[PDB]
C-alpha cells in the first residue's frame, strides 16, 4: 500500500508537470516594465521526493515509527519527515497539521513563475527582485492564461455568435508603475478583457471611467459619497 | 465578434451604500479614495452578485486583510446593512441583449452573521430604466425607500415585455448566465464554481503576493482523490497491523 | 446501423470534443450538452432535451457506437467512450 | 459552427498485449529519431520533413492505433460484462465460478495492459520534453509546438485511461462480487424471481401493504421560518453625480504648480524654495497656505536636488509668509 | 445488566445511525449501509433488544432486515400505499435481475417507470392514482409524478438513495426485498400475507 | 466497552416506553412521575445515549425532558405545521395566567376555537384553510377538522392531556411553554404572548 | 508617515530618496510655523 | 498551582522525585497536570518550567 501511494503520487505529479508545461505555451510578449515574457516552472520538491522514495522502497525500515500507538497516521508521516530531511525539522506547528499538509500531493511540487526580465533571460519572478507592478502583471498574465484556457475549452459548446463576457479585478493598483498599468490595459483590450482597478491615488486618470469614494459619519451611521472624475486637472 | 460587456453595478442598502450605481467602462473602470473608502466593499458586492454561493465567499482584503476589514462574518453580513439589499449587474450580450442579473441579500437574524441570498435575473428591461430607480421607490421627500423581492416582482410584472426569473439554485443561475455568454466555463459542478471563485479572488488581490503564491497550487492543480484513497488504504492497513500486533 | 443526420452530427461533435478532451473521457454531463447544441443548431424540439438525449445515447450505445461506464463520481455519474466502429465512421470523413 | 457544416452536408444512413508492446517499441524508436532530428535543427524545410511530416502523421497514426487497441480492450471488457450477465441468466448459481474466473482474467489483462503502457510512457514523456526543448531551435516551429503540445496530452490521456479503466473495472467487479452474495445466495434456485414476477403481474389480488413504526419520525417545534433582519429601509437617493478633475480642489493647482515648476526644469533654472514659496503663497489665504506648501514641495523637490546639501552646511529657516511660517531649504541646483 | 455482545453492539459507532433510522422507518440493505454492515454482526442481539419496545427486526431468507411494530408497539405504527409496494417490487426485480448488472446498481426514474408499465397494466394500475381515470394522458403524467413521489418516500424509508449530484439517478437497498415478502416462499401469497399481518409485517390499505 | 450505569439505565424496565415516546417527540414533564424520576436519576448517561443519535436530551427550566433534534439528527425529523405552531401558541396562551379566570385548567375545543378565531388574523386563518375562502361555513368546518387533527398531534407529543372521552376537552401541560416566550419577572404573560402571536 | 498623514502642526520634514552622483541620498525640505 | 504548591505538592512528589525529568520540567508537568484542558504550543517542558 505504501508503494502504491508513492507510485500514484508520482504519477499524479508527472501528469500535472506535463499539463503545466503544456499550458505554459501560447503567451505573447507582455511588456510589463522590464518583464518581456512570462513562463511557469513546475518541479518536484526534493524534501518530499526523498520522503516519497523512503515510502516506496523503505516503508518497512521505519515501521517502528508507524506502529507507534502514540503516533497517528499524519503524526507518523510528520515524524518520518522529521527523521529524514531533518533540515525541515519543525514541531511548533503541530505534527498532525504538517502531516496533513503532507497528505496533499500538490504541495510536493514547487510551482513558480519565470519572467524574461529585460535581456537577463528567464529569472524566477521573486517579489523581492521584481518591481511590484511587474509582479502584478505576472499574476494577471497567469490569470488570463487560465481564463483563456477556460474559454477555449468551452469554445465548442458555445456558439461563435456569443463571445463570453470578460471581467477581472485588481486592488491596490498604486503598486503598479505606468508601464505596468499601460501593459495591463493593452493586454486586456487586446483580449477584449474588462478590468476593475482600485488605488488610493488615481493611477489611471487618462484611461477608462473613474469614481472617487469618501466615507462620512452621520448621526451614528456611515454614508459613502461617490463623485465622478474627469481626465485632466 | 462583439464581446458582451458589463455596463453598471448597483449596490443597494450596502454598508455605506444605499442606492449607489457605478457605470462600468467598456475596458477600464477605476475607483479611488483614501483609507477605508470602501472600494473592497464594492468589489466584494460585485463578486457576490457574480457567485452568490455563500460558502465560497470569504473576503479577506488584499491588504489589511482579515476580520478588522469587517469580515469576521465572511465580509458579507456586516458589509451589508440590516434588511433588504441588492447587488445587480447589467450586461449587454454579444447578441446585443440587455440582461440584468442580480441577487437580493438580507442579514440573517440572531447573533449569527449569516446572509440569506436569492439570485434573480431580468430580461427585456428598457435600456433607459436604471436599476437604481427600478430597485427603489420614492417614499418621503428626496429619501427613497428600497422595496423587497415581492414588490420588485409586482413592479416588473406590471411592465410590459420584461421577464423576471428567480433561480431556485445557483447552478441554474450560472447555467443561464453562461447560455447568455456571461461565463466562459459551464460551472456545472460546485468544483467548477470553486476554481472560478479562486481565479476571481486571486485577481482581486492581484499579483504574486503571499496569498496568491500560496494558493497558486490550488489555482492551477486540480485536487485528486486518488492520492486520498491511497493514503486512506495505507491508514487502514496500518491500523489493522497495529491490531494484529497487540 | 442507422445514423440520422442529427445522430451522425452528434457523433462528429463527440469525436471532435474527444480530440479536444483533456483525458479523452466523456462524461454524460458533456454528452447531454453536445446533444443540446446539435439539436439547437438543427432546431428540432419533439420533447424535452433530456428524453431525446437519453434516447439518442441509448441508440448509439446499442448500435455499437458508444461504450458506457458507470461511475458515481463522474458528472452525471457516468462516462462514455467511442467504440472502434464509431471511430472508423468519424475518421472516414474527418 | 460545425453544426451547420454537418447540417448542410446532409450525410446520414487483437487484444494480445504483444501488439501493444511492438507498437510501444515502434513509438519509442520513431519518437527518439524525430527528437534527434529536431535537435539537429536543420533549415525550415529540414525542420518540416523531420518534425512535422514524419512526426505528425506517424505519431498520430500510432497514437490512434494504440487508442484502437485501448478501444478493443474496451469492447472486450464490455463483452465479458454482457457474457457474465448472460451466463448468470442461463446457469444462475452454476455461473458463480465462471464469472469469478472471468473477472480474475479480465483483471489480469487490464493489469498487464496498464503495465505495458506505463513501461514506456515516462521515457516517452522525457522524449517529448526533449522535443519541446529542441523546438526553440527555429522561430517558425510554432506548429511543431502544437504537435509537441498535443502529443503530450494524448500520451497522458492514454495513460489516464490505462489507469481509469482499472479504476472502473475494480469497482464494477465489486458490484458483481456483491451481486453474488446479494442476489443468488438468497435465490439459489431462482424461484423467487419467477414468483416475484407473477406476484407483480397479479398484485392487487393479494392486497397488502407493509407495516412500520413510521407514525412519526421525530415531531418537533417548527423553525422560526424566514424571520430576518429588516427595517423597511430608506435613504437619501444619490443626486446627479458631480464631477471633479481628479481632486481638482487640489489638482487644478497641482497642474498650475507642476507647470510653474516644469518651467524651472525646462530652463534648469535654480529654484529657491524660500523665494518661490513666498512669492506664491500670497495668491492664497492663510488657512489654505499649508495645503499649498505641501503641494508645491511635492513638486519642487522632484526637480533635481540641492548641491549645497552635500557641503555640510545646514540651510536656514527662511520665512515665506506672515504668521511665522518657515521653510528650511537649500537652493535646488542639480537637475 | 446486559450481555457482552449486546452492549458491544450498542457501543458501536454505527449503532446510533442504525437505531435512529430504523425508528424513522428506514430499512436494512446493501444501501442503507451504516445500518447493515454491523447489524449483520449482532442480528440476534438487536432483535432481542428491539423486542423490549414491542417491535421486531425481521429478516426473511433474504439478507435484508426491516422493522415491524407490534399491535402493542411502543413506537407507534403506520403503513405504506399500494403504489409504494408496486415501485418496491419493480425495484426488487431490478435488484435481482442480473441483466442490468452493468448498471452497477444505478438506475433512473425513467427506467423504473418503463419497467413498471411494461410488467404491470397501465389502466388498472392508474385506477388507484385517481379513481376516475380512463386513459387520459394527464392521469398518466399524474401517475409518473406519483411514482417520483413514492420513490422519494421510499428514499425516506430506506429503499433507495439519490446520488449526491443526481436526484434522477439512484441506488437501491436490499431492503427492497421486503417488497418480496409475499414471494420469499413458495406458499400461497394470500396465506403468507395472513402470516405477515399475524406478524404485523403487512396489512391491506 | 460501555459505561456500566448506561447499561443499567438502558436495561431498566422503564427504558423501552420512555425511549419510544422520546423517539416520537413526546416531552416528559414532572407529571410523568416514574419517567421524570428515572430521567432525573439517569440523565448523565441518557444525554450521551441520545447525543449518539445527535439528539440532545434537554431538561427545560420548567423541568420537562424533551429530545431536541440537531440539524444532523440521526432520527429524521418531522415538524409541527404552521397551524400546529399557531395552535400551540394559542394552547400556551390557554395555559397562561388568564385561563385561571375562565377555564381553571380544563378547556374545550370551543375555547381554543373561539380564541383562535378572535385573536388570529383572518389572513393566516385563510392561509390555514385556503386564500380564496371567505368566512364560509364549510371552510370553518375544514378549519375545525384541522384544529382537531393538530390537537391530537399535540396529544401524541404529550403536550395536551385529553380527558378520557370522545368529547374534545383536555388539560395543557407545562411543556407547552416551548411554544411561548420565556417568562421574565415583571413581564405580563398576556402582553408577551400576544406580541408573539401577533 | 508616508505622506498620507502630514498635518499642519509641527516641524514637517519632506524626505525624498534620490541618487545624487551615484550616492544614495534623501533630500529633506523643512517646514514649520504652520497652524 | 500556587495553592497546591502551598499545601498539596506533597501528593505530587511522585512527579517531583522522578529522575526522568528536571525541576523546571517537574513544574511544567505539574501545571499541565493542573488545568489539564489547557494545552501549550507543543514546546519543551523545559521552557514551560
Automatic annotation (TrEMBL), chain A:
It is found in: Cytoplasm, Nucleoid. It comes from the Bacteria. Mg(2+) 2 binds at residue 171. Mg(2+) 3 binds at residue 172. ATP binds at residues 117, 131-134. Plays a central role in chromosome condensation, segregation and cell cycle progression. Functions as a homodimer, which is essential for chromosome partition. Involved in negative DNA supercoiling in vivo, and by this means organize and compact chromosomes. May achieve or facilitate chromosome segregation by condensation DNA from both sides of a centrally located replisome during cell division. The hinge domain, which separates the large intramolecular coiled coil regions, allows the homodimerization, forming a V-shaped homodimer. Belongs to the SMC family. MukB subfamily. Homodimerization via its hinge domain. Binds to DNA via its C-terminal region. Interacts, and probably forms a ternary complex, with MukE and MukF via its C-terminal region. The complex formation is stimulated by calcium or magnesium. Interacts with tubulin-related protein FtsZ. This is Chromosome partition protein MukB. It comes from Photorhabdus thracensis. The lineage of its organism: Bacteria, Pseudomonadati, Pseudomonadota, Gammaproteobacteria, Enterobacterales. The chain holds residues 1236 to 1468 of 1482 of the full protein.
From TrEMBL, chain C:
GO terms for cellular component: cytoplasm; nucleoid. It comes from the Bacteria. Keywords: Calcium, Cell cycle, Cell division, Chromosome partition, Cytoplasm, DNA condensation. Its main location: cytoplasm. It is found in: Cytoplasm, Nucleoid. One of its GO terms (molecular function) is calcium ion binding. GO terms for biological process: cell division; chromosome condensation; chromosome segregation; DNA replication. Residues 1-94 form the Chromosome partition protein MukF winged-helix domain. Signal peptide: none annotated. Interacts, and probably forms a ternary complex, with MukE and MukB via its C-terminal region. The complex formation is stimulated by calcium or magnesium. It is required for an interaction between MukE and MukB. Involved in chromosome condensation, segregation and cell cycle progression. May participate in facilitating chromosome segregation by condensation DNA from both sides of a centrally located replisome during cell division. Not required for mini-F plasmid partitioning. Probably acts via its interaction with MukB and MukE. Overexpression results in anucleate cells. It has a calcium binding activity. Belongs to the MukF family. This is Chromosome partition protein MukF. It comes from Photorhabdus thracensis. The lineage of its organism: Bacteria, Pseudomonadati, Pseudomonadota, Gammaproteobacteria, Enterobacterales. The gene is mukF. The chain holds residues 22 to 115 of 440 of the full protein.
From TrEMBL, chain E:
GO terms for cellular component: cytoplasm; nucleoid. It is found in: Cytoplasm, Nucleoid. This is Chromosome partition protein MukE. Its main location: cytoplasm. It comes from Photorhabdus thracensis. It comes from the Bacteria. Belongs to the MukE family. Pfam families: MukE. One of its GO terms (biological process) is DNA replication. InterPro entries: MukE_C (IPR042037), MukE_N (IPR042038), Scp_MukE (IPR007385). Involved in chromosome condensation, segregation and cell cycle progression. May participate in facilitating chromosome segregation by condensation DNA from both sides of a centrally located replisome during cell division. Probably acts via its interaction with MukB and MukF. Interacts, and probably forms a ternary complex, with MukF and MukB. The complex formation is stimulated by calcium or magnesium. Keywords: Cell cycle, Cell division, Chromosome partition, Cytoplasm, DNA condensation.
Amino acid at each position: 500500500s505504501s508503494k502504491s501511494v508513492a507510485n500514484i503520487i508520482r504519477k499524479t505529479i508527472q501528469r500535472e508537470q506535463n499539463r503545466i508545461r503544456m499550458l505554459n505555451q501560447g503567451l505573447q510578449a507582455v511588456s510589463f516594465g522590464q518583464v518581456r515574457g512570462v513562463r511557469l516552472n513546475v518541479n518536484v520538491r526534493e524534501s518530499h521526493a526523498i520522503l516519497l522514495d523512503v515510502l516506496s522502497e523503505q516503508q518497512e525500515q521505519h515501521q517502528d515509527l508507524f506502529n507507534s500507538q502514540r503516533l497517528t497516521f499524519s503524526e507518523a508521516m510528520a515524524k518520518l519527515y522529521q527523521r529524514l530531511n531533518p533540515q525541515v525539522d519543525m514541531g511548533q506547528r503541530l505534527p498532525q497539521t504538517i502531516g496533513e499538509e503532507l497528505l496533499d500531493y500538490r504541495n510536493y511540487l514547487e510551482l513558480d513563475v519565470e519572467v524574461n526580465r529585460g535581456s537577463d533571460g528567464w529569472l524566477k519572478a521573486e517579489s523581492g527582485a521584481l518591481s511590484t507592478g511587474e509582479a502584478i502583471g505576472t499574476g494577471m498574465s497567469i490569470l488570463v492564461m487560465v481564463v483563456q484556457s477556460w474559454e477555449e475549452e468551452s469554445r465548442r459548446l458555445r456558439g461563435k455568435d456569443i463571445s463570453p463576457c470578460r471581467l477581472l479585478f485588481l486592488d491596490q493598483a498604486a503598486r503598479l508603475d505606468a508601464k505596468s498599468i499601460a501593459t495591463l490595459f493593452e493586454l486586456c483590450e487586446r483580449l477584449q478583457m474588462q478590468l476593475i482597478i482600485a488605488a488610493p491615488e488615481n493611477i489611471s486618470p487618462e484611461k477608462g471611467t473613474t469614481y472617487k469614494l469618501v466615507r462620512k459619519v452621520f448621526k451614528n451611521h456611515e454614508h459613502v459619497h461617490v463623485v465622478g472624475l474627469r481626465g485632466f486637472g | 465578434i462583439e464581446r458582451g460587456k458589463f455596463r453598471s453595478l448597483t449596490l443597494v442598502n450596502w454598508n455605506g451604500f444605499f442606492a449607489r450605481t457605478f457605470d462600468l467602462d467598456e475596458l477600464v473602470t477605476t475607483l479611488s479614495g483614501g483609507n477605508g473608502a470602501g472600494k473592497s466593499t464594492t468589489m466584494a458586492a460585485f463578486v457576490t452578485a457574480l457567485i452568490p454561493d455563500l460558502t465560497l465567499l470569504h473576503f479577506r482584503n488584499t491588504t489589511e486583510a482579515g476580520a478588522t476589514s469587517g469580515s469576521r462574518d465572511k465580509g458579507l453580513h456586516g458589509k451589508l446593512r440590516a434588511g433588504v439589499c441588492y447587488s445587480t449587474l447589467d450586461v449587454i450580450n454579444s447578441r446585443h441583449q440587455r440582461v440584468v442579473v442580480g441577487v437580493r441579500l438580507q442579514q440573517v437574524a440572531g447573533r449569527d452573521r449569516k446572509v440569506d441570498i436569492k439570485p434573480f435575473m431580468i430580461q427585456g428591461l428598457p435600456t433607459a430604466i436604471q436599476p437604481t430607480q427600478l430597485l427603489t421607490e420614492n417614499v418621503g421627500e428626496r429619501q427613497a425607500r428600497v422595496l423587497p423581492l415581492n414588490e420588485l416582482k409586482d413592479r416588473l410584472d406590471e411592465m410590459e415585455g420584461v421577464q423576471f426569473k428567480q433561480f431556485n439554485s445557483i447552478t441554474d443561475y450560472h447555467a443561464q448566465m453562461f447560455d447568455l455568454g456571461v461565463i466562459p466555463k459551464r460551472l456545472r459542478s460546485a468544483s467548477d464554481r470553486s476554481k472560478f471563485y479562486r481565479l476571481i479572488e486571486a485577481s482581486l488581490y492581484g499579483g504574486i503576493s503571499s496569498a496568491i503564491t500560496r494558493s497558486l497550487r490550488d489555482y492551477l492543480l486540480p485536487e485528486n482523490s486518488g492520492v486520498r484513497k491511497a493514503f486512506q488504504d495505507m491508514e487502514a492497513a496500518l491500523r489493522e497491523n497495529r491490531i494484529t500486533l497487540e | 446501423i442507422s445514423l440520422p443526420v442529427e445522430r451522425l452530427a452528434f457523433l462528429m461533435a463527440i469525436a471532435v470534443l474527444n480530440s479536444e478532451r483533456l483525458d479523452g473521457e466523456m462524461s454524460e454531463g458533456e454528452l447531454i450538452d453536445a446533444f443540446r447544441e446539435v439539436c439547437k443548431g438543427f432546431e428540432q424540439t419533439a420533447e424535452s432535451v433530456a428524453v431525446r438525449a437519453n434516447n439518442a445515447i441509448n441508440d448509439m450505445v446499442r448500435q455499437k457506437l458508444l461504450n458506457r461506464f458507470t461511475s458515481e463520481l463522474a458528472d452525471g455519474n457516468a462516462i462514455y467512450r467511442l467504440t472502434p466502429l464509431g471511430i472508423s465512421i468519424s475518421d472516414y470523413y474527418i | 459552427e460545425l453544426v451547420s457544416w454537418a447540417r448542410k452536408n446532409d450525410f446520414s444512413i487483437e487484444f494480445s498485449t504483444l501488439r501493444l508492446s511492438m507498437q510501444l517499441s515502434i513509438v519509442a524508436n520513431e519518437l527518439h529519431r524525430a527528437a534527434e532530428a529536431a535537435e539537429e535543427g536543420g533549415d525550415e524545410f529540414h525542420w518540416h520533413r523531420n518534425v512535422f511530416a514524419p512526426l505528425k502523421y506517424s505519431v498520430a497514426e500510432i497514437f490512434d492505433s494504440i487508442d484502437m487497441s485501448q478501444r478493443l480492450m474496451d469492447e472486450q471488457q464490455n463483452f465479458v460484462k454482457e457474457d457474465i450477465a448472460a451466463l448468470l441468466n442461463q446457469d444462475w448459481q452454476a455461473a458463480i465460478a465462471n464469472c469469478e474466473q472471468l473477472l480474475s482474467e479480465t483483471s489480469g489483462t487490464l493489469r498487464e495492459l496498464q503495465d505495458t503502457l506505463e513501461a514506456a510512457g515516462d521515457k516517452l514523456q522525457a522524449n517529448l520534453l526533449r522535443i519541446q526543448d529542441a523546438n526553440m531551435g527555429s522561430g517558425g516551429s510554432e506548429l511543431v509546438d502544437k504537435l509537441v503540445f498535443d502529443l503530450q496530452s494524448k500520451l497522458d490521456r492514454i495513460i489516464s485511461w490505462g489507469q481509469q479503466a482499472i479504476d472502473l473495472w475494480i469497482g464494477y467487479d465489486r458490484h458483481v462480487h456483491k451481486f453474488i452474495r446479494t442476489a443468488i445466495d438468497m435465490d439459489k434456485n431462482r424461484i423467487f424471481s419467477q414468483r416475484l414476477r407473477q406476484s407483480v403481474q397479479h398484485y392487487f389480488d393479494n392486497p397488502w401493504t407493509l407495516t412500520v413504526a413510521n407514525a412519526e419520525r421525530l415531531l418537533d417545534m417548527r423553525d422560526e421560518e424566514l424571520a430576518l433582519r429588516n427595517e423597511e429601509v430608506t435613504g437619501e437617493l444619490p443626486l446627479e453625480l458631480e464631477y471633479e478633475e481628479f481632486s481638482e480642489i487640489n489638482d487644478q493647482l497641482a497642474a498650475m504648480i507642476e507647470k510653474a515648476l516644469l518651467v524651472y526644469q525646462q530652463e534648469q533654472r535654480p529654484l529657491d524654495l524660500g523665494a518661490v514659496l513666498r512669492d506664491y503663497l500670497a495668491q492664497h489665504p492663510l488657512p489654505r497656505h499649508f495645503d499649498v506648501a505641501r503641494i508645491l514641495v511635492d513638486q519642487a523637490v522632484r526637480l533635481g536636488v540641492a548641491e549645497a546639501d552635500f557641503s555640510g552646511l545646514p540651510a536656514e529657516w527662511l520665512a515665506i509668509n506672515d504668521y511665522g511660517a518657515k521653510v528650511q531649504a537649500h537652493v535646488i541646483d542639480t537637475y | 445488566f446486559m450481555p457482552v455482545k449486546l452492549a458491544q453492539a450498542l457501543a458501536n459507532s454505527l449503532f446510533p445511525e442504525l437505531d435512529s433510522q430504523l425508528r424513522a422507518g428506514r430499512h436494512i440493505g446493501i444501501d442503507d449501509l451504516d445500518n447493515h454492515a454491523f447489524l449483520m454482526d449482532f442480528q440476534e442481539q438487536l432483535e432481542e433488544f428491539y423486542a423490549r419496545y414491542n417491535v421486531e427486526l425481521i429478516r426473511a431468507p433474504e439478507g435484508f432486515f426491516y422493522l415491524r411494530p407490534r399491535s402493542t408497539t411502543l413506537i407507534p405504527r403506520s403503513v405504506l400505499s399500494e403504489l409504494d409496494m408496486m415501485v418496491g417490487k419493480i425495484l426488487c426485480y431490478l435488484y435481482l435481475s442480473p441483466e442490468r448488472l452493468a448498471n452497477q446498481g444505478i438506475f433512473t426514474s425513467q427506467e423504473l417507470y418503463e419497467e413498471l408499465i411494461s410488467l404491470a397494466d397501465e389502466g388498472k394500475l392508474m385506477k388507484f392514482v385517481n379513481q376516475r381515470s380512463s386513459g387520459s394522458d394527464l392521469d398518466k403524467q399524474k401517475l409518473q409524478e406519483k411514482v417520483r413521489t413514492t420513490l422519494n418516500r421510499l428514499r425516506r424509508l430506506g429503499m433507495v438513495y439519490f446520488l449526491p449530484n443526481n436526484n434522477n439517478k439512484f441506488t437501491i437497498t436490499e431492503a427492497v426485498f421486503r417488497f418480496g415478502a409475499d414471494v420469499r416462499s413458495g406458499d400461497d401469497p394470500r396465506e403468507i400475507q395472513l402470516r405477515m399481518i399475524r406478524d404485523g409485517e403487512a396489512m391491506p390499505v
